[PDB]
Each structure stands twice: as structure tokens, then as C-alpha cells.
């Protein structure tokens, strides 16, 4: 047959994406809990300015979702070969023209530049329209980062909803939570303002918070409340106002997906994912 | 006709709640709908007789409105051949039989999602987020499943009274991780969620380990806030509920969809603090 190709996109506690070493090889490394750190190489631009040529290279990547693709290919007896998104995104549906496309890790699985998304990937209407979501492989939901001493109440309150631009807030660009923002009228006042200042990634928000260069960050709880446990100048604050899952990524005529959703609730079963909570997710505090 | 449906059900509060009809008029009002449940005559006789009743809550919220989105009818029965769902000699009892065995086309309730009840139904994406959780009196420590109290239940004098409602999916859980935990445990078995809570209250147990989402309600109703779920409700082996609908359904598709959005359109928050808030 053929290798699975595997897309994934940089996304820390999920995806850690590091450079080789000089011999094109992973360095060797240990978590927390003095284990080794199982790496896979990874090729995906190393440029990623908007608007230019993007060159691949290898790259070296681990993680929760990394350690699940692992047991996912062990399981199930296939092998693989892992990319990072070309363009960055996780994947939302635009308008071009009354066409629509989809862009990101979304667009990669239906053109056939990939057969699975392995990442952080949020299930919601709009994208199982177009393709098979696994069971949910973590449960969580929406928050907001921001900095130490930073007092709003959560998502309710009036310097979100009665916004102004003395006080900025924005998530990433072409992800799940842009798509909500956009499809709930009753959100519309902060689509709005959030359209204004959205970011290109994760990493770029959560720097930017810590920058006080924007105010408050909205985005995936996972994400959040990890990053919070490990830099003590962030913190999220009103709880999940949101809630949704990851799921893994396949295209609707693939042979996997009944025994990856099978592997998945075996994993939580068997304390298998809590494992990963434990390595990846669950081990700092402040 | 392929549009009007046979839907089983289990009555679980605040998930299903069962009520009696009007004698007069013998008509389900207000937000309840028409369900049916088969009551038997004598144990010496199969005759019984199918007792008209009204069902309401919040997965009935659910199919009231998956049946306006997807565009069915339905016949909706209460489930008599166990509960939930558990696999006896090989043959399925309680809803899943009812899907396995093609007497519904679908099961819609408080029906947890696991690995082998997926190998005989399909599920829907999950609507409400459960696992295997704690409920202990304030204050009692104990980490988590994984406590030595539960594991090695004997290395405390006295040991641990612990127990959950057998032949669920927690009970399931727990024989396959935990065979010595498990094997203690059964002198515990609760007939109901209503004895374990008693139990608890008065002091003849200690933890009861059940499905997350009706401790958390029940941690929400309880008189003086006493019983709490342990961790800040803290859950193992996280799932959800989720539709059971037979292999190769051709409704699976229209029913996720429809669940997903109104998940994404906040109709989901709306419904759970219809029926799933509690004062503590
Ligand atoms: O958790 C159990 O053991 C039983 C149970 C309790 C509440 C909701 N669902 C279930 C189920 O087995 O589907």
C-alpha cells in the first residue's frame, strides 16, 4: 500500500517542534518523569512570514499528540511519515467569488496532502461536514489568557462585550475559535473587534500577552492553562466559557477511522491518556 | 413509514424524568412527550400491557429537537431488560440490546460511550461530558481512583468502605483496571444511585464511585452541600453520552451534525442550566 502522511502543527504541550541536530538526527532528551522522549522527524517550512516562499526542511517533533500518532501506528500496524501544515493554520472554511475552500490542516486532509491530522484539532459542525472526527482524544474548552494582574471576569465581562481599543483582545486567525466567534450573532460585537487584531499562531498570542501588547488571548483551555502553569506573569481567568474536544482527522472514505475512534476510548479506558496528561500536560503549577 | 422511529430510553434524572399521565385527559403536557413503558401482568404469565406516560428532561430536550432538525417521528419506550447496557453470556441488556437486537433505531438517554459497547452500536458524537468520578463527605482525602485507599483496600484498619451501583459502565471499568479493588468492592454494591447517597450520608460508606455527570448533579442538589465529588471534580477515563444508533445507521450523520451545532450555537449551555444546575 502506501505510508500514512501524517500533518500536525506546532502547538506546545500537543506538538513540540525543534530544529535537528548537525547530523539530521533528534536529540536525545527526557521528561519529566525521566522517561525518553519518543521524536519523530517532521518536515514543514521553516519560514513562516505571510506572503512568501515557504522552504521545508527536517524538523524534529514530540509531544502528547506525537506519543498518541505512536500508539495510534503501533495499534493499528500502519507506518507513517509526519509534516507540519504548510500554511500554518489549523483549518477554516472562507469565501474567495461564491466558492468556498478550506485553508490549513482542513485543507491538506481533502486535497490528499495528508490521510490523518494528528494535532490539537477542535471538533465542530463545520468541519464534520467535510471529514471524519475520531471520539474526542481530550475534552476541554475555551478560556482566556492574560497577564498577572490583569482583572476581568471572563467572558462577560463589559471590556469584551462593550469593547474599545484601549483594551485589545484577539485569537488565532483560521482556527475553531474564529469559526465560533463568526457564527454566533450574539458574538458578533467581539468577532468584530477580535478580526482586528487576530494573530498568525498560538505562540505569537501567548508572546504577545506577555509583551502587554495584547490584552487578553482566547483560546484553547489545554493550551492556556498549560502555558499558565509554566510562565507566573500569565493566567487564565473565567473558567471554560466553552466546551469541545479534539478529535483525530481523517477523510470520510478512510479505512482507519472505526478502529482509531476504538483506540481512542480504549486510551482513556486503560488510563492511557491520563499517562500523557501526566507527561505532557500536568506537571508544573506555579 | 422509514421516517417514523422507535426510540428507547431509560429514566435516570435530570437526563429522563418519568412521570404519570393525566387520567383525564390522558394527554402529556407542557414539555414532557408521549412514552411508554411495558409493565407486566404476574410473574407467572408474558402478558403485560403498555402504560401510557409522559418523559421530560434534558435528553428529551435533545430529541425534541433533533427530531425538528433531522425531520423524524418518533415512538419513544421505556427500556425493561436491565438498564443502560451490559453484556451477559455474550447477549446485550438494557438499550444497547434494544439497538443490537434492532427493537429501536435508537437509544437516547444518559448512555455513557466505551469501547465495547461501540463494537455492537454506533454512537453519536458525545453531548454531555461524563467518566468515572468520586463522591465522598466534604473533606475526605483521597486522591483520586488510583488512592492506595481504593487499590489495596486491606492495608488500612479499618479499611475503606467503598462501592459504586453494579453492572454499569464504571463497574465494567473497574473489574478490567483494578481486579483487587473490584473483588473487594462488591460487598458495597448499591441497588441504586438513592441507596448509595443514604449510605453516604449516614456513615455506612465512605466513597461511592459512579458516572461523573449524575455525581456532579447530585453533588449540586445535595441538602447542605455535604457530598462533594472529589479533585474539584476531578474524572477518570473522560467520555460522554452519546446516541446509540445501529451499525451503518443511516441517521448517524444528520445526528451528529445536528448535535455539533447545537453545541456551536450555545443551545447545549442553554439546556444545562435548564436541567443541570445546582444550588451548591
Ligand atoms: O456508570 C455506570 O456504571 C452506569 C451509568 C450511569 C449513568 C449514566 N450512564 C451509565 C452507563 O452505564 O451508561
Known sequence: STRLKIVTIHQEPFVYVKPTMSDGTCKEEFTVNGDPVKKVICTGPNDTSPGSPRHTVPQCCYGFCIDLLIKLARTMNFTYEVHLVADGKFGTQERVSNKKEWNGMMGELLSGQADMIVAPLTINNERAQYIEFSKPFKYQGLTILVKKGTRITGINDPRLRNPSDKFIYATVKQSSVDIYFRRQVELSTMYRHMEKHNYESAAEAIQAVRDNKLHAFIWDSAVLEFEASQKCDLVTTGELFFRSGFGIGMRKDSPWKQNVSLSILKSHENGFMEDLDKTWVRYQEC | ?280
Open chain 2, 1 to 280: 413509514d422509514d421516517n417514523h422511529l422507535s426510540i428507547v430510553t431509560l429514566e435516570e434524572a435530570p437526563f429522563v424524568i418519568v412521570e404519570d399521565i393525566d387520567p383525564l385527559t390522558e394527554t402529556c403536557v407542557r414539555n414532557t412527550v408521549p412514552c411508554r413503558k411495558f409493565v407486566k401482568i404476574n410473574n407467572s404469565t408474558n402478558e403485560g400491557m403498555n402504560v401510557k406516560k409522559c418523559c421530560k428532561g434534558f435528553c428529551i430536550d435533545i430529541l425534541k429537537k433533533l427530531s425538528r432538525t433531522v425531520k423524524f417521528t418518533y415512538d419513544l419506550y421505556l427500556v425493561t431488560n436491565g438498564k443502560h447496557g451490559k453484556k451477559v453470556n455474550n447477549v446485550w441488556n438494557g438499550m444497547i440490546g434494544e439497538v443490537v437486537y434492532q427493537r429501536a433505531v435508537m437509544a437516547v438517554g444518559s448512555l455513557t460511550i466505551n469501547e465495547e459497547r461501540s463494537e455492537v452500536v454506533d454512537f453519536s458524537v458525545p453531548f454531555v461530558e461524563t467518566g468515572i468520578s468520586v463522591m465522598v463527605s466534604r473533606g475526605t482525602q483521597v486522591t483520586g481512583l488510583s488512592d492506595k485507599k481504593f487499590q489495596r483496600p486491606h492495608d488500612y484498619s479499618p479499611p475503606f468502605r467503598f462501592g459504586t451501583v453494579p453492572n454499569g459502565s464504571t463497574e465494567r471499568n473497574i473489574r478490567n483496571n483494578y481486579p483487587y479493588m473490584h473483588q473487594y468492592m462488591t460487598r458495597f454494591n448499591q441497588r441504586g444511585v438513592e441507596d448509595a447517597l443514604v449510605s453516604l450520608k449516614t456513615g455506612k460508606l465512605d466513597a461511592f464511585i459512579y458516572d461523573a455527570a449524575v455525581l456532579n448533579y447530585k453533588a449540586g442538589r445535595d441538602e447542605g452541600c455535604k457530598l462533594v465529588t472529589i479533585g474539584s471534580g476531578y474524572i477518570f477515563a473522560t467520555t460522554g453520552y452519546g446516541i446509540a444508533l445501529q451499525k451503518g445507521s443511516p441517521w448517524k450523520r444528520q445526528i451528529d451534525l445536528a448535535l455539533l451545532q447545537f453545541v456551536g450555537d450555545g443551545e447545549m449551555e442553554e439546556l444545562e442550566t435548564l436541567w443541570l444546575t445546582g444550588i451548591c
